[PDB]
Design a protein around this ligand. Structure first.
Ligand SMILES: CCCCCCCCCCCCCCCCCC(=O)OC[C@H](COP(=O)([O-])OCC[N+](C)(C)C)OC(=O)CCCCCCCCCCCCCCCCC
Ligand SMILES: CCCCCCCCCCCCCCCCCC(=O)OC[C@H](COP(=O)([O-])OCC[N+](C)(C)C)OC(=O)CCCCCCCCCCCCCCCCC
Ligand SMILES: CCCCCCCCCCCCCCCCCC(=O)OC[C@H](COP(=O)([O-])OCC[N+](C)(C)C)OC(=O)CCCCCCCCCCCCCCCCC
Ligand SMILES: CCCCCCCCCCCCCCCCCC(=O)OC[C@H](COP(=O)([O-])OCC[N+](C)(C)C)OC(=O)CCCCCCCCCCCCCCCCC
Ligand SMILES: CCCCCCCCCCCCCCCCCC(=O)OC[C@H](COP(=O)([O-])OCC[N+](C)(C)C)OC(=O)CCCCCCCCCCCCCCCCC
Ligand SMILES: CCCCCCCCCCCCCCCCCC(=O)OC[C@H](COP(=O)([O-])OCC[N+](C)(C)C)OC(=O)CCCCCCCCCCCCCCCCC
Ligand SMILES: CCCCCCCCCCCCCCCCCC(=O)OC[C@H](COP(=O)([O-])OCC[N+](C)(C)C)OC(=O)CCCCCCCCCCCCCCCCC
Ligand SMILES: CCCCCCCCCCCCCCCCCC(=O)OC[C@H](COP(=O)([O-])OCC[N+](C)(C)C)OC(=O)CCCCCCCCCCCCCCCCC
Ligand SMILES: CCCCCCCCCCCCCCCCCC(=O)OC[C@H](COP(=O)([O-])OCC[N+](C)(C)C)OC(=O)CCCCCCCCCCCCCCCCC
Ligand SMILES: *[C@@H]1O[C@H](CO)[C@@H](O[C@@H]2O[C@H](CO)[C@@H](O[C@@H]3O[C@H](CO)[C@@H](O)[C@H](O)[C@@H]3O)[C@H](O)[C@H]2NC(C)=O)[C@H](O)[C@H]1NC(C)=O
Ligand SMILES: *[C@@H]1O[C@H](CO)[C@@H](O[C@@H]2O[C@H](CO)[C@@H](O)[C@H](O)[C@H]2NC(C)=O)[C@H](O)[C@H]1NC(C)=O
Ligand SMILES: *[C@@H]1O[C@H](CO)[C@@H](O)[C@H](O)[C@H]1NC(C)=O
Ligand SMILES: *[C@@H]1O[C@H](CO)[C@@H](O)[C@H](O)[C@H]1NC(C)=O
Lengths: 182, 1278
């Protein structure tokens, strides 16, 4: 019911920590294990490579639950590499007046999850087009310099989402939820 | 006459160029790129070689040792033969192309010299040429010894103040034998291992010396202060102004703050600025010697109206400006291009047809034979042909686009003033043309030598092909990343050969930066002067309110007190009060910050009130006394009065407002920026700084005309750059993506740890990195998509900072041929164009002091006339004879070997600072113990002088006083060292050794003159340095309010930011030396979504100001770097010709002066300095040598010299300077050395002496060797 917040069952909802305990039931609201804002409802309503909606509730195509758990795991492994680079950025306490590395690692986590699951989200009161999290990261995170070896990056930072006047936030508006403290 | 025919002589010089072009193609990499090169180069070498051996045998066997060109030709045919013998093996199965045998091809490119052969009687006799060359060689050798003294001085200081830069911050999970890229911090950083002695790493990190963790010297890097050898190398690379701030930041992190700030700032001021200006002065005095030597050596009838009318000229000029702006206006706009038949091409074909019609009308009306003879019409034909080709569909926007943008050249006819200035500054094409040709030929020969020296390494790129080698040598010449070019070779050639390639790059960099750049300065200055005959002709042809007024004009208050009274009398009492309250206001402003504003802090606001309360009284008193502008004594006289009332108004308006919140792009923010102008009124109040400002603005018209030329150059390269590069120079962030359809999703990007510290990867290990969206983007510092962006990129390139990034990005993202664009702009703009400001500033400085109107003979005379006023008799007492002991001690202490062994012992003691004098290393104990032995030897040498001459006479010499003081400090250190054995006694030991090392500048005569030249140039330049510092304060205060909260970026970090006035001042000093100022500007330009905005408070947001940064940085760099620093060059050039002297049989030399001093000091025994006339006739007999008045034959000169001194004081007595000034006037060619005012007075005096000596020689009968050469000339003329 509530956003994932704190607790395994106290928010009137749980997470799919195991494959087999969900053969059938009736109400879809089980949250993931790392990308905690996404439930099985909007995931099965979106796109799954092995199989799609309805054959889920009918056992026969449950293989999609393991596919979502695998995507949730890959999203976590990529996050670790980011937050170890952020830990080894010794000027994270002083680089910006309004930003904080806590805000940065929240909006970058929300960005990685919207890359792995491009599905819509709803019924959280606060909604925002998922493309905004690119602009959150480029605003709230440090200037990390890319390694000029083969390509010469002429003063641009590692994380950027726009170039050559291309359109952005074009009303596609994949409705995500506002999962940030500020 | 096979040899003698002129028709083969031209061929035998042109084919030398082909023999250079062939060896530039002998390389393993160009042969694997193009296999037929290996076959064509061999036959092209073979049939060439026959021509040179055919002349070589015929000129010796049929027509023929001592001729230098005959042995040169013989060596060069041997080079062709051994090159062919090697190539016929390398093309076979004998040896491969990557073998090192190719090094036997490095002497061949020197055949470039045969191609010229212009070395015989170029307007001057040989002897006269060798007199120029040797005279400049001894000057250059003198300055090389002077530079080596400074390089070793900062070497022994750097060893003692700094050590190893190896204490990096490391994640603790690192074990000793596993140090890798993943164990380092990402913004890679040093620490001090001692607490409070530098930087210390945050929790989860620790620091330890990575060299003890198994890293080798080539993995750490070559820059450090571990020994004098590496320290002299880092002193040289820092003194080149190439990465010096990175050494400063590394030293700030590893060691105490104060020693880094002292050392690196003083190193820049001396070894970068003041010393390089002495090499410029030597090459300018070499050009002065050349003019000395050149001067001393001696229907259709409508043609009458339609071609002439102002209507036709103005119509063509406006059509050219319209065509140029239409051509440049084709900005990006979008990804749609259809250029076979499109818009912006129809305009270009229409204007090309108009200029065809114009040219054909001129050719018809004037006739082709009368048209083609004009140089302007030859150039307009070249553009009319080149643009007719450019507008063909297959050639549009190609390399033919130069003929399009060169149309703006015709527009120079707008004003005769710009035409006259162009013809003045570029002068006779023969002077600048031969220098740019020499520069090109030198660079081509040096890149061909480096190519054949390095192309086979196989572990080193940048020397694999001729264009790569040429780019590398050009990059070394232009001062950009030159040390990185050297380091890439050093770590690839191997440790056995690293010293050999190091001295090769150092010798090339020395010559290319000290000689070639100063030759351009000297040529442009030589063009800006009049010719010596034209200035000779010019000289020859020119011959109750009264109470308030009393309050305003208050009165002022031996020689030591008179100098203080002069100082106190400098300004009125009221202006001293205004200096004081201005200074205390600037000192209050030094404590302001984005987090501590005067608007919220009463303690700083006290100065804000005091300034307004005193300045309101000041302006009211001055207005009540003398009025606004109604009289020549009034307060609003000029721009100074306007500036002070403006400063008062913005100050009062701010004080009565005090806005409690201020938005980042507001009128309140602008008022707080305008409030930072207060330091400017100190220029008005101090009259020496009024003089500096008025002497600076004497050049404004010349400076403006140079700016119009540079803007014209930037506009053609910007117009070309927009037409060629718009929409290109943009690619995917992902290195593995080559098409725009693949720039979607995410990829793992590798983060920059450090460009130094070159560690190898472990075989399975990934670099540090994270997951990132891939996009198709421009670079963030230059995009080439419209004229504004193109001109901003070219303005940054013009300063030589980041130009290599622009070069590589054009080569990579557009194509290899487009390298020509960036190399040509860097030559025209940076080498030639910015040297026009250097010439204009130094020329206008010499016009302000009036010496621009003097002949080189008169300038030399004026510099002699001041040098002989500075001169004095010797302090040395005569040798004693009352006892044999002081007499033999006087002989011993004066021996010519004893002076040299004492000078050698100072170097021998200075060498004990080869390694750090710490307390833990046992090697410190022998080194300190040896310094005690040297100290006792110097105590004995001081004793030998004290027993050779009286202590009262000994102490008169400054050298003796200084060496006694240093020897007293030495024996004091000796007793303290054995008493305490602590680190402070080893530090004091290093200090007294450094103090003694300065003594050699008092012992070597040429080194003394060069030290005096620099020391007096620091005194002369004081108010110019204070003027620059007042501008640093204005910009620092503005930078704190305008950029103080900017989010960290490419170069804005913890070491460099505007968070306080102190941090702003050090960031401005980086920008004065030019270290990456543009990367910083692009950080200060930051706007959303890269930063977090705020609605109404500038200290809340972390965004920058786009237009603010463009105005703040560009203005600062132009006024300080292009303008103000060039006055310090002018000051060194003024003082070098004064204090430096050499042997020259035209003037009284320092050898003549020393010989005169020694002979004066045996007649004036009692050292009174003033001799009776009775002894003058005796004194002028002892002067044998080059001053010799012969008693016989030259009797008239003898009688003249006696009578001149007897007349001067009507008998009595005569000072040292009166005899010395007689000797100077009696040993120069006064008819060219003197100015026309003093020449008449001398000649009148000497004619009176002729009449009086004639009267005396009649009366005494009726009663019953430069001096004698100049007397012979005078007698012959009179
Ligand atoms: C005599 C020669 C006179 C030449 C005058 C140059 C005018 C160029 C006109 C082209 C144009 O409109 O640019 C389109 C583009 C249109 O921009 P755009 O189409 O990218 O729109 C975005 C603009 N930005 C990103 C800057 C906000 O305008 C320019 O940027 C031109 C800059 C104006 C001129 C800059 C300085 C010129 C100084 C010349 C010295 C004389
Ligand atoms: C490191 C080694 C130390 C190098 C020492 C510095 C050497 C200085 C260069 C010597 C220039 C001598 C030229 C004299 C020729 C002359 O009469 O005219 C002056 C010439 C120009 O004379 P001009 O003929 O063009 O016209 C001068 C005046 N009128 C027109 C009336 C004739 O000046 C130059 O050419 C300056 C650049 C020459 C550079 C070429 C050789 C460089 C050698 C490098 C070593
Ligand atoms: C100059 C004479 C150089 C002779 C040295 C050649 C020896 C050799 O094998 O090559 C050395 C190395 C070879 O590089 P390398 O050895 O790393 O690569 C090839 C590897 N082996 C040896 C296995 C084939 O290359 C050099 O760079 C030597 C020449 C540079 C030094 C020349 C400087 C002289 C200029 C001074 C003027 C003042
Ligand atoms: C660089 C270090 C090397 C030695 C520097 C010492 C130079 C001493 C002064 C130079 C000199 O000749 O003084 C004679 C001067 C000139 O007085 P004068 O007019 O009687 O003599 C003229 C001096 N000559 C001929 C050399 C030009 O004495 C002064 O009156 C100096 C005024 C004192 C300073 C007043 C303004 C300073 C306030 C601003 C400071 C803060 C701004 C930041
Ligand atoms: C750049 C630095 C600008 C400093 C502040 C500008 C005011 C300087 C000043 O008034 O200096 C006195 C100088 C005057 O120096 P002065 O020596 O002519 O003053 C005496 C004048 N007579 C002899 C007539 C009594 O003010 C000027 O007008 C200098 C020339 C113009 C400078 C314009 C700068 C524009 C930016
Ligand atoms: C003595 C020394 C004097 C030297 C004086 C130099 C002063 C520099 C003046 C810069 C003017 C900038 C004004 C401006 O940007 O307007 C605000 C406006 C308003 O900006 P904005 O805030 O509306 O736009 C937001 C930012 N964008 C649009 C990019 C998203 O700027 C623009 O938007 C215009 C874009 C292009 C501006 C022109 C680019 C620079 C051209 C520089 C020319 C080269 C100078 C070389 C001088 C040569 C001397 C030798
Ligand atoms: C007549 C001139 C026509 C000859 C063309 C010259 C340039 C074409 C190079 C094509 C291949 C480039 C290549 O492989 O080299 C890689 C290199 C570097 O590539 P990279 O390795 O940095 O990538 O390319 C270049 O740097 C070529 C650009 C040329 C730079 C200037 C050359 C001027 C020549 C002397 C002029 C002096 C008078
Ligand atoms: C040994 C360790 C390193 C040394 C290498 C040197 C590297 C470069 C630094 C050297 C700086 C200058 C050293 C030159 C040695 C001076 C010799 C000397 O003073 O001889 C006097 C010689 C001989 O002249 P003199 O000694 O007769 O001149 C004496 C001057 N009066 C009359 C005032 C006493 O002068 C030259
Ligand atoms: C010598 C000079 C030494 C110090 C000067 C430092 C140079 C920095 C330049 C900063 C410019 C950026 C200002 C920021 C800003 O608010 O931008 C918007 C500003 C103004 O904001 P605005 O105009 O939008 O505010 C509107 C409100 N009213 C109606 C009151 C105007 O844009 C400008 O017009 C720029 C002002 C140009 C003047 C710059 C100051 C130097 C003047 C030289 C004085 C001559 C003495 C010599
Ligand atoms: C090597 O890196 C790690 C990473 O920081 C450092 O370990 C850290 O040590 C501190 C001090 O013990 C830990 O803080 C406190 O730990 C104690 C129990 O260990 C706990 O009671 C406190 O509540 C607090 O957490 C810190 O947690 C610990 N880091 C981790 C992984 O938890 C280690 O010390 C580093 N080496 C150095 C230079 O200290
Ligand atoms: C990031 O760095 C990695 C190194 O970990 C690069 O991978 C190398 O790519 C080159 C291609 O030229 C291969 O020859 C090497 O074998 C690769 N290294 C390893 C360890 O496999 C990679 O190209 C870089 N990628 C980016 C995006 O910068
Ligand atoms: C119960 O089953 C129906 C079947 O259509 C489904 O739509 C509904 O969501 C299920 N209940 C809950 C609470 O999800
Ligand atoms: C440390 O170094 C040794 C080799 O000397 C290696 O065998 C070991 O695996 C390394 N340990 C780590 C954690 O890298």
């Amino acid at each position: 019911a509530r956003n994932w917040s704190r607790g395994a069952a106290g928010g009137d909802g749980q997470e799919v920590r195991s494959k087999h305990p969900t053969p059938l039931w009736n109400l879809s609201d089980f949250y993931l294990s790392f990308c905690n804002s996404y439930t099985l409802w909007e995931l099965f309503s979106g796109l799954s490579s092995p199989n799609t909606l309805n054959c889920s509730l009918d056992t026969t195509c449950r293989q999609c639950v393991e596919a979502y758990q695998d995507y949730d795991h890959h999203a976590q492994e990529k996050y670790e590499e980011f937050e170890s680079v952020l830990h080894k950025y010794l000027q994270s306490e002083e680089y910006s007046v309004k930003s904080c590395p806590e805000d940065c690692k929240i909006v970058y986590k929300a960005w990685l999850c919207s890359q792995y699951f491009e599905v819509t989200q709803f019924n959280c009161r606060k909604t925002i087009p998922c493309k905004q999290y690119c602009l959150e990261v480029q605003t709230r995170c440090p200037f990390i310099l890319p390694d000029n070896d083969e390509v010469i990056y002429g003063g641009l930072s590692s994380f950027i989402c726009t170039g050559l006047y291309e359109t952005f936030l074009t009303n596609d508006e994949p409705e995500c939820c506002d999962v940030r403290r500020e | 006459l096979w040899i003698n025919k002129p028709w083969v002589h031209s061929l035998l010089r042109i084919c030398a160029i082909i023999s250079v072009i062939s060896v530039c193609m002998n390389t393993p990499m160009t042969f694997e790129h193009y296999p037929p090169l290996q076959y064509v180069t061999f036959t092209l070498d073979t049939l060439l070689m026959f021509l040179y051996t055919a002349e070589m045998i015929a000129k010796m066997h049929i027509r023929g040792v001592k001729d230098r060109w005959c042995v040169f030709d013989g060596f060069m045919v041997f080079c062709l033969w051994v090159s062919l013998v090697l190539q016929v093996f390398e093309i076979a199965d004998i040896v491969d192309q990557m073998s090192p045998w190719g090094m036997l091809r490095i002497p061949r490119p020197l055949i470039m010299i045969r191609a010229f052969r212009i070395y015989f009687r170029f307007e001057l006799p040989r002897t006269r040429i060798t007199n120029i060359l040797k005279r400049s060689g001894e000057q250059i050798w003198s300055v090389s010894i002077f530079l080596l003294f400074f390089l070793l001085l900062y070497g022994i200081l750097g060893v003692q103040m700094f050590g190893t830069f190896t204490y990096h911050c490391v994640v603790n999970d690192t074990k000793p034998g596993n140090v890798t890229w993943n164990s380092l911090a990402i913004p890679d950083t040093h620490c001090s291992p001692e607490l409070e002695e530098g930087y210390q790493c945050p929790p989860g990190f620790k620091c330890m010396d990575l060299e003890d963790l198994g890293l080798s010297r080539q993995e750490l890097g070559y820059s450090g202060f571990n020994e004098i050898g590496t320290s002299i190398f880092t002193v040289y690379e820092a003194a080149s102004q190439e990465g010096w701030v990175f050494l400063m930041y590394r030293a700030i992190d590893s060691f105490p703050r104060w020693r880094s700030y002292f050392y690196f700032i003083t190193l820049i001021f001396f070894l970068a600025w003041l010393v390089k200006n002495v090499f410029i002065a030597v090459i300018i005095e070499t050009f002065a010697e050349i003019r000395v030597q050149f001067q001393q050596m001696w229907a259709p009838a409508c043609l009458q109206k339609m071609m002439r009318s102002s209507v036709f000229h103005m119509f063509i000029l406006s059509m050219v400006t319209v065509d140029v702006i239409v051509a440049a206006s084709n900005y990006y706009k979008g990804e749609n291009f259809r250029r076979q038949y499109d818009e912006f091409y129809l305009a270009e074909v229409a204007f090309t047809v108009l200029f065809d019609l114009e040219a054909l009308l001129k050719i018809w009306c004037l006739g082709f034979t009368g048209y083609i003879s004009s140089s302007l019409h030859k150039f307009e034909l070249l553009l009319v042909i080149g643009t007719t080709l450019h507008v063909y569909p297959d050639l549009y926007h190609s390399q033919f686009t130069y003929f399009q943008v060169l149309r703006v050249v015709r527009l120079i006819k707008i004003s005769p003033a710009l035409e006259d200035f162009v013809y003045k500054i570029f002068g006779p094409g023969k002077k600048l043309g031969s220098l740019v040709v020499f520069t090109a030929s030198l660079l081509i020969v040096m890149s061909a030598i480096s190519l054949q020296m390095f192309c086979f390494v196989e572990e080193l790129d940048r020397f694999t092909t001729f264009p790569r080698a040429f780019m590398s040598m050009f990059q070394i010449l232009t001062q950009e990343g030159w040390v990185d070019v050297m380091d890439q070779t050093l770590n690839a050639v191997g440790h056995m050969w690293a010293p050999v390639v190091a001295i090769y790059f150092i010798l090339y960099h020395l010559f290319a930066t000290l000689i070639l750049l100063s030759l351009f300065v000297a040529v442009i200055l030589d063009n800006l002067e009049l010719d010596e005959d034209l200035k000779k002709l010019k000289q020859l042809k020119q011959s109750f309110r009264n109470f308030c007024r009393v309050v305003v004009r208050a009165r002022f208050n031996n020689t030591k007190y008179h100098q203080l009274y002069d100082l106190l009398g400098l300004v009125t009492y009221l202006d001293w009060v205004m200096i004081i309250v201005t200074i205390c206001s600037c000192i209050s402003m030094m404590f302001e910050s984005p987090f501590r504003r005067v608007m919220h802090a009463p303690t700083l606001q006290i100065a804000e009130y005091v300034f307004v309360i005193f300045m309101s009284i000041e302006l009211n008193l001055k207005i009540m006394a003398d009025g606004l502008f109604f009289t020549p004594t009034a307060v609003i006289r000029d721009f100074g009065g306007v500036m002070d009332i403006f400063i008062y108004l913005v100050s009062l308006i701010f004080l009565c407002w005090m806005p409690q919140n201020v938005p980042a792009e507001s009128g309140a923010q602008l008022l707080m920026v305008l409030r930072c102008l207060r330091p400017l009124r100190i220029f008005k109040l101090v009259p020496q700084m009024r003089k500096v400002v008025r002497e600076l603005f004497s050049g404004f018209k010349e400076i403006f005309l140079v700016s119009i030329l540079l803007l014209t150059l930037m506009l053609v390269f910007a117009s070309f750059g927009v037409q060629l590069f718009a929409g290109k120079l943009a690619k995917c962030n992902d290195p593995n993506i080559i098409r725009r359809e693949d720039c979607n999703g995410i990829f793992r990007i590798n983060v920059s740890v450090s460009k130094n510290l070159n560690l190898k990867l472990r075989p399975g290990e990934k670099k540090p990195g994270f997951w990132v969206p891939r996009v198709w983007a421009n670079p963030r510092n230059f995009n080439f998509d419209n004229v504004g962006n193109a001109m901003l990129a070219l303005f940054e390139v013009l300063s030589l900072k980041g130009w290599v990034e622009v070069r590589d990005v054009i080569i990579h993202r557009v194509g290899p041929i487009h390298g020509i664009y960036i190399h040509v702009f860097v030559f025209l703009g940076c080498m030639i164009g910015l040297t026009l400001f250097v010439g204009v500033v130094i020329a206008n400085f010499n016009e302000n002091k009036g010496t621009a109107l003097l002949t080189v003979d008169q300038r030399r005379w004026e510099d002699l006339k001041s040098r002989l006023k500075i001169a004095q008799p010797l302090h040395l007492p005569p040798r004693p004879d009352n006892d044999g002991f002081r007499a033999k001690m006087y002989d011993i202490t004066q021996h010519p070997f004893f002076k040299r062994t004492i000078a050698l012992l100072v170097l021998a003691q200075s060498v004990l600072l080869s390694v750090k004098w710490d307390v833990e290393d046992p090697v410190t104990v022998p080194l300190a113990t040896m310094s005690v032995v040297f100290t006792f030897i110097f105590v004995l040498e001081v004793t030998m002088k004290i027993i050779a001459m009286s202590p009262a006479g000994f102490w008169q010499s400054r050298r003796n006083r200084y060496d006694l003081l240093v020897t007293s400090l030495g024996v004091v250190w000796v007793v303290l060292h054995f008493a305490l054995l602590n680190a402070y006694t080893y530090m004091m030991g290093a200090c007294v050794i450094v103090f003694r090392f300065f003594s050699i500048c008092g012992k070597h005569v040429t080194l003394k003159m060069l030290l005096l030249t620099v020391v007096v140039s620091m005194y002369k330049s004081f108010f110019i340095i204070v003027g620059m510092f007042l501008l640093l304060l204005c910009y620092a205060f503005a930078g704190v309010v305008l950029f103080g909260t900017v989010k960290y970026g490419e170069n804005i970090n913890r070491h460099a930011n505007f968070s306080s006035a102190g941090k702003a001042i050090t960031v401005l000093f980086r920008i004065v030396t030019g270290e990456d100022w543009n990367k910083i500007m692009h950080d200060c330009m930051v706007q959303p979504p890269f930063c977090t905005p705020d609605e109404f408070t500038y200290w809340a947001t972390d965004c920058g100001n786009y237009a603010g940064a463009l105005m703040y940085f560009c203005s600062f760099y132009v006024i300080i770097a292009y303008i103000m620093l060039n006055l310090l060059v002018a000051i060194i050039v003024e003082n070098f010709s004064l204090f430096y002297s050499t042997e020259e049989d035209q003037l009284l030399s320092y050898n003549d002066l020393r010989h005169f001093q020694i002979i004066w000091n045996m007649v004036d025994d009692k050292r009174e300095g003033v001799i009776p006339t009775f002894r003058v006739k005796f004194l002028l007999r002892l002067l044998r040598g080059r001053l010799e008045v012969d008693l016989d034959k030259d009797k008239l000169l003898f009688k003249h010299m006696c009578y001149e001194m007897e007349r001067l004081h009507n008998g009595g007595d005569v000072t040292f300077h009166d005899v010395l000034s007689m000797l100077s006037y009696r040993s120069v060619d006064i008819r060219k050395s003197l100015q026309l005012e003093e020449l008449l007075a001398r000649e009148q005096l000497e004619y009176t002496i002729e009449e009086e000596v004639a009267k005396q020689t009649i009366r005494m009968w009726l009663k019953k060797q430069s001096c004698s050469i100049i007397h012979s000339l005078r007698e012959s003329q009179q």
